[PDB]
Amino acid sequence: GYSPTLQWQQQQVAQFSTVRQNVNKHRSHWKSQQLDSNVTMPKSEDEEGWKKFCLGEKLCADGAVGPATNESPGIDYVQIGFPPLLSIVSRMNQATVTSVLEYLSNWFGERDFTPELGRWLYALLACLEKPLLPEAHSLIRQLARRCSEVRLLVDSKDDERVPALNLLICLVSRYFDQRDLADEPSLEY
């Protein structure tokens, strides 16, 4: 069923609808307490606070090689920082993360794509609701196109990540209905 890949395609997007259901369940639980349980939002006028607080500085220090992770063995929450959660995200506006997107693009590095952001990438879609502003539609188009550059660099199409990457692109085209990125055949004459 190389041609009919719709079956697998549904599973990817299908998960997105499911994710929203989970949020509703925790809505009642969070309502039982205010934003103070474990969420500190730096003043709005301090844009620097949002970028650092939300993405933390641990990314800069990196943690995966081994000793880098244990670069602060004292407690736990401190050497872990504040990770993204429903409570943190629930208070964040759709527009707030949108502006923060500009800073992310600045890193550029072409060949760079830091798979670390991917974990974060999913949160952005969950934070987007209602119709996307004209500007919002344009930006999502920008990041998807850049990814294509990585494929050219890859020596072998049968790589190992390519399959996941292929599925990832399909998600954007159907969910947002952006037929512009959709891989249409040939109109079938």
């Binding site: 990817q12 998960q15 994710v19 639980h29 429903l86 991917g118 949160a123």
Partner: peptide, 26 residues
């Protein structure tokens, strides 16, 4: 009681979704 409920249901559900999508290759 003290009442400290909040982790009753894996709130990390969002995190789990990350591995499944990427894992989609095995």
């Amino acid at each position: 009681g003290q009442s400290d409920d909040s982790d009753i249901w894996d709130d990390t559900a969002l995190i789990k979704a990350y591995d499944k999508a990427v894992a989609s290759f095995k």
